[PDB]
């Protein structure tokens, strides 16, 4: 019988609040980034580097609040964040993504991003096409905020990331979150929306591994010309590579 324990409602309450403390749906800090230019070879690189850098900071803030994450070694915390960052950024961006025009709508036209914006940061359709496909299939799940925050947390605490030490520890933390998610859908997600919802959510994590790979490829090519590398941030260089 599907029962959401005390522990499980606690986990969801913590992850919701963690998300609330690290995602500002008013997008007010965007005015601090180097300004967007849509005139234009890699004209969007400065602005989008800043947006991603900022996003990395919020992801790290969210990760620290994941129940059990604290119990990991600093080294494993680091490995989980470096490998998952771009994935959790893609996940968290779903909240501003819109199927009307397939863009990310962050409050205003200046901060409304589409495929050509992402191109003008130095990316090709090899990445962007499967990116848009992902966003669409994710948006169509119409996840409860509860499922969304659990999905981000499950993504971060992944035992198979290359470089993990205490995989067994990472696996047990993630299981506690998996089980909370499975149980949540059962108890609080009505059919038909609930049908295979967990398997479809995990499929989105598989999709993200592939997006992560392609992003890495194009980032290594982007960041090889030191003139592009110059336009990035110190946090982006540290987290994505140098």
């Amino acid at each position: 019988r599907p029962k959401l324990s005390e522990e499980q409602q606690h986990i969801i309450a913590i992850l919701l609040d963690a998300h609330h403390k690290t995602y500002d749906p008013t997008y007010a800090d965007f005015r601090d980034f180097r300004p967007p230019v849509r005139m234009s070879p890699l004209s969007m690189l400065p602005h989008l580097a800043d947006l991603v850098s900022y996003s990395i900071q919020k992801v790290i803030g969210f990760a620290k609040m994941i129940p059990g994450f604290r119990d990991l070694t600093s080294d494993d915390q680091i490995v989980l964040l470096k490998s998952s960052a771009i994935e959790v950024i893609m996940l968290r961006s779903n909240q501003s993504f819109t199927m009307d025009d397939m863009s990310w709508d962050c409050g205003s036209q200046d901060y409304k991003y589409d495929v050509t914006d992402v191109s003008k940061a130095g990316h090709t359709l090899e990445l962007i096409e499967p990116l848009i496909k992902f966003q669409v299939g994710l948006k169509k799940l119409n996840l409860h905020e509860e499922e969304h925050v659990l999905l981000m947390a499950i993504c971060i605490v992944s035992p198979d990331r290359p470089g993990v030490q205490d995989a067994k520890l990472v696996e047990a933390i993630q299981d506690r979150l998996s089980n909370t998610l499975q149980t949540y859908i059962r108890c609080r997600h009505p059919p038909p929306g609930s049908h295979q919802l967990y398997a479809k959510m995990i499929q989105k994590l598989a999709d993200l591994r592939s997006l992560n790979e392609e992003h890495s490829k194009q980032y290594r090519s982007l960041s090889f010309q030191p003139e592009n590398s110059m336009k990035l941030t110190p946090l982006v260089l540290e987290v994505f590579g140098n």
Partner: peptide, 11 residues
Amino acid sequence: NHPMLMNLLKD
């Protein structure tokens, strides 16, 4: 060698 990520992670 991750001073900034380390710093943002600290208690």
